[PDB]
Symmetry: D2
Subunit: 222 residues, 4 copies
């Protein structure tokens, strides 16, 4: 009784296009990714095409490179997958504890076996001797995103933690808004457990590979 949608194959690839500006530095990143949407497992190779090498931590960009690769159980409506073939948009604001702010905008369509993601990031007020600019980050902690529906949109908040060179953590608030381009069956209050890891990286992070697992769940208690 767990139902797949005919536009999303059990194995799909995607292409990501990303322009951005962080502390006034402009950069373009391109990426090819592949995974199993209904199993919530994905991987993507990223090439920095313009503005490399990047003067900030890679870890601030990693969470902007693929939402349809979430495992939804049979009793929870998959808002994102239901939106295809037309697609979805999302906007995101990331708030770090040293005062830095990022705004993100993403549009997503499909072209046969392939997802197209366009993504812009604008990041400002990054402490010049902070972990992001001194590249003292060491990958994300596994997160749980709270999600609910409001005005036919899907809101998501996530308290995240960048691991720091020399132990300790650098905190960040995620607030996500997902807008389907087509009326879909809205889900209730639910959670997405996520783990993102950077798997391979050359020395100047101009060529990076990362893998994500994304599982949607109910309350684990009751």
């Amino acid at each position: 009784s767990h139902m797949m949608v005919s536009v999303i194959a059990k194995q799909m690839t995607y292409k990501v296009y990303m322009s951005g500006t962080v502390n006034g530095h402009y950069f373009e990143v391109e990426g090819d990714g592949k995974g199993k949407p209904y199993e919530g497992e994905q991987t993507v190779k990223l090439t920095v095409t313009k503005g490399g090498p990047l003067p900030f931590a890679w870890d601030i960009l990693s969470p902007l490179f693929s939402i349809p690769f979430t495992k939804y159980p049979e009793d929870i409506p998959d808002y994102v997958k239901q939106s295809f073939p037309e697609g979805y948009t999302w906007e995101r604001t990331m708030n770090f504890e040293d005062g830095a702010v990022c705004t993100v905008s993403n549009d997503s369509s499909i072209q046969g076996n392939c997802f197209i993601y366009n993504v812009k990031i604008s990041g400002v007020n990054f402490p010049p001797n902070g972990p992001v600019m001194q590249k003292k980050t060491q990958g994300w902690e596994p997160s749980t995103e709270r999600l609910f529906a409001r005005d036919g949109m899907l809101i998501g908040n996530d308290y995240m933690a960048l691991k720091l060179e020399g132990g300790g953590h650098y905190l960040c608030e995620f607030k996500s808004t997902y807008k389907a381009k087509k009326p879909v069956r809205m889900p209730g209050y639910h959670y997405v457990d996520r783990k993102l890891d950077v798997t391979s990286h050359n020395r100047d992070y101009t060529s990076v590979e990362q893998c994500e697992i994304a599982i949607a769940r109910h309350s684990l208690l009751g």
Copy 2:
């Protein structure tokens, strides 16, 4: 597993004394609890001693009434349980989406097989037609606190939500600091799942019963 500690029984009680001002209204509340600390289970009966009946939704008080009762797996250092016999303190900020703010301090100490909790709460800028002042809230969704160690303190953040009448959600944002009165072993980044329900109540919530499950865990994906 659960690394049991000789000072805290498998079956314990607690006495909670709470005083507080919300929207200028002063109130005092006393309570008697009981639970299985190494299993993360507990009920508690409250009585509003002074300022009953209360002009705000019981639900804004519900999460200030018992942290020892948290099932920690043996591979996670149990910060609060090591803090005893001496005791611990915690401070909290409860920031609601409609501009309400609450500040909470607590002082915990043990007496045989009885826990002692003193807790003061200050709450302001609660909209007079909002859900809390109009008493239209219907209890807390299950949540997942993110705790980590910093300067010998345990820092938790959680993105909460009050269920509302006629569907919908009233978003709250919790930020807690836990401070043991005695050097203890620090835990790594880890999570606590919680479900908290008002089981019984009189007609003006001057007598209330609540029950809490609370289980520590690692990432469900790694």
Copy 3:
């Protein structure tokens, strides 16, 4: 055509009562003050009656010790003064940049020549080696409060700056809500320039004297 109100003499005294808790430390402060309401000049002697000596900076409490001592020009309605003889309430939230939060609640009545102020403060999550707890503060900078009316209330935001031992500043956001206990003539968008200085202080800040000047104005341009 600048109009005084018969309940507020050109010279008035006041009495302040303040209970509070900061980083879990309880304290009571009492104060006698005197000034010229229509000239916006005041002074008050503060005695710490309980919980002294205080383990935190004095400068976090100073801005909670007298609003009717503001100079309003003839063309701007004085919301606060118009509320007497019955009085006003106000709630305040102070947000420091090291993450600390304070909530404040104040009720104000009049008794002949004398204003009575009751004030509670709850302050939490103050970094233990931050300027407030290490007492590295050196008085407030002069502030301008933006003020406007909403729902027959007066909202006030102020970006403030504590001066630091060794130069540099420790920032704080003020958000104030004033509620008259009686319908008054609402004012428009306007500014209150304020300067608070601590004038005298014994060595343990158990006996402190401070003076404030508070001037309400229009836009200085146009």
Copy 4:
């Protein structure tokens, strides 16, 4: 007074190029300005080059179109004016009360008696029935930025407000970082008063004229 500087005339011009995405809508805007830098006076005519007409209130763009044109008294070190001939950069966060966020970066350089400004803006989570998306805003109230020196950067915060149709105010909160490309003399805690008006506009705001006064000052009370 005004400590004049040989690189910046008493009468100067500027060319502003702006690109930006607000609510996923991409737009480009070019402009020609002129003003009396040591008097703090300037007009500028804008033309929307790409993405005209704009689906949001002009007023959210109005404050991203010229910091050299600020009357500094001789007793205040004029951070931006010392930064030239090289140039300066600034980053800004514009946080609105209804959850909207904008991020802005700018790069400034001089060319004879012409200033060059490049400015990108990212804006997200703008409510579709809110005042900006419904174009019900009617220009900015006069404001007062609070600037101070930190790690060789100038940090300004200001509490702003957009005038609304049918009375009322739509609150915004500005946080700017100013960074000169060349060691300059740092100013003390000081204030900037500003008034900014849309003087003229076509019917779809694809041609707009704005005028700005901007005067630095010490505390008006000390």
